Write a protein that binds this DNA or RNA. Structure first.
Ligand SMILES: [Zn+2]
Length: 252
DNA sequence: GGTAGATCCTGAC
DNA sequence: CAGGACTAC
Protein backbone atom coordinates (compact mmCIF):
# COMPACT_ATOMS: atom_id res chain seq x y z
CA UNK A 1 0.00 0.00 0.00
CA UNK A 2 1.09 3.58 -0.70
CA UNK A 3 0.83 6.63 1.56
CA UNK A 4 -2.84 7.33 0.76
CA UNK A 5 -3.72 3.69 1.47
CA UNK A 6 -1.72 3.75 4.71
CA UNK A 7 -3.59 6.85 5.83
CA UNK A 8 -6.85 5.02 5.13
CA UNK A 9 -5.60 2.06 7.16
CA UNK A 10 -4.68 4.34 10.05
CA UNK A 11 -8.13 5.95 9.99
CA UNK A 12 -10.11 2.72 9.71
CA UNK A 13 -8.00 0.49 11.96
CA UNK A 14 -7.91 2.81 15.00
CA UNK A 15 -11.52 2.40 16.19
CA UNK A 16 -11.18 -1.37 15.76
CA UNK A 17 -8.31 -1.65 18.25
CA UNK A 18 -8.34 1.43 20.48
CA UNK A 19 -8.81 0.59 24.16
CA UNK A 20 -8.00 -3.10 23.68
CA UNK A 21 -5.38 -4.77 25.89
CA UNK A 22 -2.76 -7.17 24.52
CA UNK A 23 -2.80 -10.61 26.14
CA UNK A 24 -0.45 -12.41 23.76
CA UNK A 25 1.76 -11.80 20.74
CA UNK A 26 2.37 -14.68 18.35
CA UNK A 27 5.13 -14.59 15.75
CA UNK A 28 5.37 -17.04 12.87
CA UNK A 29 8.12 -15.28 10.92
CA UNK A 30 10.62 -13.72 13.38
CA UNK A 31 12.53 -11.86 10.65
CA UNK A 32 9.69 -9.32 10.51
CA UNK A 33 10.70 -8.25 14.03
CA UNK A 34 13.56 -5.76 13.79
CA UNK A 35 13.67 -4.39 17.35
CA UNK A 36 14.09 -5.73 19.88
CA UNK A 37 16.16 -8.10 17.74
CA UNK A 38 14.88 -11.01 19.82
CA UNK A 39 11.28 -11.74 18.79
CA UNK A 40 10.61 -13.21 22.24
CA UNK A 41 11.48 -9.86 23.86
CA UNK A 42 9.26 -8.09 21.33
CA UNK A 43 6.32 -10.30 22.28
CA UNK A 44 6.93 -10.20 26.05
CA UNK A 45 7.12 -6.42 26.38
CA UNK A 46 3.84 -5.79 24.55
CA UNK A 47 1.76 -8.07 26.76
CA UNK A 48 -0.40 -6.14 29.22
CA UNK A 49 -0.30 -2.90 27.23
CA UNK A 50 -3.44 -1.22 25.91
CA UNK A 51 -3.73 0.38 22.47
CA UNK A 52 -4.14 4.14 22.93
CA UNK A 53 -3.66 5.55 19.44
CA UNK A 54 -2.56 5.09 15.84
CA UNK A 55 -0.57 7.64 13.86
CA UNK A 56 1.11 7.71 10.46
CA UNK A 57 4.49 9.00 9.35
CA UNK A 58 5.24 8.55 5.67
CA UNK A 59 4.24 4.96 4.96
CA UNK A 60 4.93 3.91 8.57
CA UNK A 61 2.13 3.20 11.02
CA UNK A 62 2.82 4.10 14.64
CA UNK A 63 0.73 2.13 17.14
CA UNK A 64 0.72 3.98 20.46
CA UNK A 65 0.41 1.76 23.53
CA UNK A 66 0.73 2.51 27.25
CA UNK A 67 4.52 2.65 27.40
CA UNK A 68 5.71 1.56 23.96
CA UNK A 69 5.16 2.47 20.33
CA UNK A 70 4.96 -0.17 17.61
CA UNK A 71 6.38 1.09 14.31
CA UNK A 72 5.12 -0.95 11.35
CA UNK A 73 5.83 -0.83 7.60
CA UNK A 74 3.78 -2.99 5.22
CA UNK A 75 6.03 -2.57 2.17
CA UNK A 76 4.43 -3.90 -1.02
CA UNK A 77 1.72 -6.28 0.15
CA UNK A 78 1.48 -6.15 3.95
CA UNK A 79 -2.05 -6.05 5.38
CA UNK A 80 -3.70 -5.71 8.80
CA UNK A 81 -7.05 -7.21 9.79
CA UNK A 82 -9.04 -7.45 13.02
CA UNK A 83 -10.86 -10.74 13.60
CA UNK A 84 -11.91 -13.39 16.10
CA UNK A 85 -9.37 -15.69 17.76
CA UNK A 86 -11.91 -18.49 17.22
CA UNK A 87 -11.55 -18.42 13.43
CA UNK A 88 -8.74 -19.93 11.32
CA UNK A 89 -5.97 -17.52 10.32
CA UNK A 90 -5.75 -16.46 6.68
CA UNK A 91 -2.76 -17.63 4.61
CA UNK A 92 0.56 -15.80 5.06
CA UNK A 93 -0.23 -14.53 8.56
CA UNK A 94 3.10 -13.75 10.21
CA UNK A 95 2.32 -11.78 13.38
CA UNK A 96 -0.80 -11.79 15.55
CA UNK A 97 -1.63 -9.50 18.45
CA UNK A 98 -4.17 -11.20 20.72
CA UNK A 99 -6.45 -8.96 22.81
CA UNK A 100 -8.16 -9.80 26.11
CA UNK A 101 -11.57 -9.53 24.42
CA UNK A 102 -10.90 -12.53 22.20
CA UNK A 103 -10.22 -10.42 19.11
CA UNK A 104 -6.91 -10.22 17.23
CA UNK A 105 -4.92 -7.78 15.14
CA UNK A 106 -3.38 -9.87 12.38
CA UNK A 107 -0.51 -8.99 10.07
CA UNK A 108 -0.36 -10.79 6.72
CA UNK A 109 2.31 -10.42 4.05
CA UNK A 110 2.78 -12.90 1.20
CA UNK A 111 6.19 -11.36 0.45
CA UNK A 112 7.35 -11.10 4.09
CA UNK A 113 9.00 -7.73 3.40
CA UNK A 114 7.23 -5.84 6.18
CA UNK A 115 9.01 -4.68 9.32
CA UNK A 116 8.16 -4.02 12.98
CA UNK A 117 10.11 -2.02 15.58
CA UNK A 118 9.05 -1.49 19.20
CA UNK A 119 10.54 1.20 21.48
CA UNK A 120 9.47 3.21 24.49
CA UNK A 121 7.22 5.89 22.97
CA UNK A 122 9.62 8.75 23.75
CA UNK A 123 12.40 7.00 21.81
CA UNK A 124 10.50 6.01 18.67
CA UNK A 125 11.06 9.27 16.78
CA UNK A 126 14.83 9.29 17.37
CA UNK A 127 15.42 5.65 16.40
CA UNK A 128 15.09 3.64 13.18
CA UNK A 129 13.09 3.51 11.09
CA UNK A 130 11.56 6.92 11.89
CA UNK A 131 14.79 8.80 12.54
CA UNK A 132 15.87 10.90 9.54
CA UNK A 133 12.43 10.57 7.93
CA UNK A 134 11.77 13.65 5.81
CA UNK A 135 8.72 15.93 6.13
CA UNK A 136 5.20 14.87 5.19
CA UNK A 137 4.54 15.73 1.53
CA UNK A 138 1.26 17.42 2.51
CA UNK A 139 2.77 19.57 5.27
CA UNK A 140 4.22 23.11 5.18
CA UNK A 141 7.51 21.47 6.19
CA UNK A 142 7.75 20.14 2.64
CA UNK A 143 8.20 23.28 0.56
CA UNK A 144 9.65 24.18 -2.85
CA UNK A 145 12.53 25.74 -0.90
CA UNK A 146 13.28 22.49 0.92
CA UNK A 147 13.07 20.52 -2.33
CA UNK A 148 15.32 23.02 -4.12
CA UNK A 149 17.90 22.77 -1.33
CA UNK A 150 18.18 18.99 -1.65
CA UNK A 151 18.15 19.15 -5.45
CA UNK A 152 21.12 21.52 -5.78
CA UNK A 153 23.35 19.55 -3.41
CA UNK A 154 23.13 16.17 -5.16
CA UNK A 155 24.38 14.54 -8.36
CA UNK A 156 21.54 12.00 -8.44
CA UNK A 157 18.55 12.01 -10.79
CA UNK A 158 15.36 13.84 -9.83
CA UNK A 159 13.57 10.49 -9.51
CA UNK A 160 16.23 9.15 -7.14
CA UNK A 161 15.80 12.33 -5.11
CA UNK A 162 12.02 11.97 -4.74
CA UNK A 163 12.36 8.31 -3.76
CA UNK A 164 14.67 9.31 -0.90
CA UNK A 165 12.75 8.99 2.38
CA UNK A 166 15.03 11.63 3.95
CA UNK A 167 13.89 14.17 1.34
CA UNK A 168 10.15 13.58 1.64
CA UNK A 169 8.21 10.99 3.65
CA UNK A 170 6.77 7.98 1.85
CA UNK A 171 6.55 9.17 -1.76
CA UNK A 172 6.17 5.91 -3.66
CA UNK A 173 7.32 4.89 -7.13
CA UNK A 174 3.87 5.33 -8.67
CA UNK A 175 3.49 8.88 -7.38
CA UNK A 176 7.04 9.82 -8.38
CA UNK A 177 6.37 8.82 -12.00
CA UNK A 178 2.92 10.43 -12.05
CA UNK A 179 4.16 13.66 -10.46
CA UNK A 180 7.10 13.92 -12.87
CA UNK A 181 4.79 13.44 -15.84
CA UNK A 182 2.35 16.06 -14.56
CA UNK A 183 5.26 18.46 -14.01
CA UNK A 184 6.65 17.73 -17.48
CA UNK A 185 10.04 16.60 -16.20
CA UNK A 186 12.04 13.56 -17.35
CA UNK A 187 12.77 11.15 -14.45
CA UNK A 188 16.39 10.76 -15.53
CA UNK A 189 17.11 14.49 -15.36
CA UNK A 190 19.86 15.35 -12.88
CA UNK A 191 18.14 16.80 -9.82
CA UNK A 192 20.51 19.78 -9.97
CA UNK A 193 19.54 20.56 -13.57
CA UNK A 194 16.03 21.60 -12.52
CA UNK A 195 15.27 25.32 -12.73
CA UNK A 196 13.50 27.20 -9.95
CA UNK A 197 10.41 27.08 -12.16
CA UNK A 198 10.69 23.31 -12.56
CA UNK A 199 11.19 22.84 -8.81
CA UNK A 200 8.11 24.96 -8.13
CA UNK A 201 6.04 23.02 -10.67
CA UNK A 202 7.27 19.66 -9.37
CA UNK A 203 6.42 20.47 -5.75
CA UNK A 204 3.00 21.64 -6.91
CA UNK A 205 2.34 18.39 -8.77
CA UNK A 206 3.70 16.21 -5.96
CA UNK A 207 1.26 17.80 -3.51
CA UNK A 208 -1.63 17.66 -5.98
CA UNK A 209 -1.04 14.03 -6.96
CA UNK A 210 -0.66 12.61 -3.45
CA UNK A 211 -3.28 15.02 -2.10
CA UNK A 212 -5.86 13.89 -4.65
CA UNK A 213 -5.14 10.25 -3.81
CA UNK A 214 -5.76 10.67 -0.08
CA UNK A 215 -9.18 12.03 -1.03
CA UNK A 216 -6.61 7.43 -13.34
CA UNK A 217 -2.91 7.10 -14.17
CA UNK A 218 -0.99 8.94 -16.89
CA UNK A 219 2.17 6.85 -17.15
CA UNK A 220 2.59 4.25 -14.41
CA UNK A 221 2.17 0.76 -15.88
CA UNK A 222 1.00 2.26 -19.17
CA UNK A 223 4.09 1.48 -21.25
CA UNK A 224 3.32 0.85 -24.92
CA UNK A 225 0.01 2.67 -24.60
CA UNK A 226 -0.76 6.18 -25.94
CA UNK A 227 -0.08 9.13 -23.66
CA UNK A 228 -3.42 10.53 -22.50
CA UNK A 229 -2.23 14.07 -23.25
CA UNK A 230 -0.34 13.76 -26.55
CA UNK A 231 -0.88 10.20 -27.82
CA UNK A 232 2.84 9.35 -27.85
CA UNK A 233 3.54 5.79 -26.67
CA UNK A 234 4.49 5.72 -22.99
CA UNK A 235 7.94 4.25 -22.45
CA UNK A 236 9.44 2.27 -19.58
CA UNK A 237 13.06 2.12 -18.45
CA UNK A 238 15.03 1.66 -15.24
CA UNK A 239 16.00 4.70 -13.17
CA UNK A 240 17.45 4.40 -9.67
CA UNK A 241 16.85 0.65 -9.91
CA UNK A 242 13.10 1.15 -10.27
CA UNK A 243 10.62 0.60 -13.07
CA UNK A 244 10.27 4.05 -14.57
CA UNK A 245 7.46 5.20 -16.85
CA UNK A 246 7.34 8.44 -18.82
CA UNK A 247 6.17 10.21 -21.96
CA UNK A 248 9.14 11.27 -24.12
CA UNK A 249 7.13 14.17 -25.58
CA UNK A 250 5.40 15.70 -22.54
CA UNK A 251 8.46 15.32 -20.32
CA UNK A 252 11.80 17.04 -20.91
C1' DG B 1 29.83 12.17 4.07
C1' DG B 2 27.45 11.08 -0.34
C1' DT B 3 26.03 7.22 -3.29
C1' DA B 4 25.77 2.72 -5.24
C1' DG B 5 25.09 -1.88 -3.78
C1' DA B 6 23.43 -5.86 -1.03
C1' DT B 7 19.36 -7.03 1.68
C1' DC B 8 15.05 -9.71 2.07
C1' DC B 9 10.91 -13.06 -0.43
C1' DT B 10 8.07 -15.12 -3.55
C1' DG B 11 4.34 -14.88 -7.29
C1' DA B 12 4.80 -14.09 -11.90
C1' DC B 13 6.58 -14.23 -16.57
C1' DC C 1 13.51 -10.05 -11.30
C1' DA C 2 10.83 -5.87 -9.07
C1' DG C 3 9.72 -3.77 -4.59
C1' DG C 4 11.15 0.10 0.26
C1' DA C 5 14.18 1.33 3.21
C1' DC C 6 22.53 -1.21 6.57
C1' DT C 7 27.41 -1.89 4.60
C1' DA C 8 31.11 -0.26 2.13
C1' DC C 9 33.37 2.12 -1.87
ZN1 LIG D 1 2.61 12.91 -23.72
Amino acid sequence: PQLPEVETIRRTLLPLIVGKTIEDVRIFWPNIIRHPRDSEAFAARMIGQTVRGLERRGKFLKFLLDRDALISHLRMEGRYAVASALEPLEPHTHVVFCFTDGSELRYRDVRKFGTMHVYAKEEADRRPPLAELGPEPLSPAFSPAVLAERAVKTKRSVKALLLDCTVVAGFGNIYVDESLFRAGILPGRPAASLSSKEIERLHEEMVATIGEAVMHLYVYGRQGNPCKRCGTPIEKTVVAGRGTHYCPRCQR
